[PDB]
Amino acid sequence: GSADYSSLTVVQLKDLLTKRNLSVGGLKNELVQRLIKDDEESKG
Numbered sequence: 178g179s180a181d182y183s184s185l186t187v188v189q190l191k192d193l194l195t196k197r198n199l200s201v202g203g204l205k206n207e208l209v210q211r212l213i214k215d216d217e218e219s220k221g
Contacts (some may be wrong), residue, residue, distance in 0.1 A: 182212025 182190060190208035194201040199215060201208040
């Protein structure tokens with residue numbers, strides 16, 4: 178009922194990815210997919 182990257186504004190998606198040593202390349206949805214796809218995969 179909250180999630181994170183789910184749908185931040187392109188400014189936040191770029192902000193977390195910028196600080197994540199990983200930027201977001203693509204449209205707003207691509208940004209959303211980059212954070213969630215990168216977040217779902219990267220996780221011990």
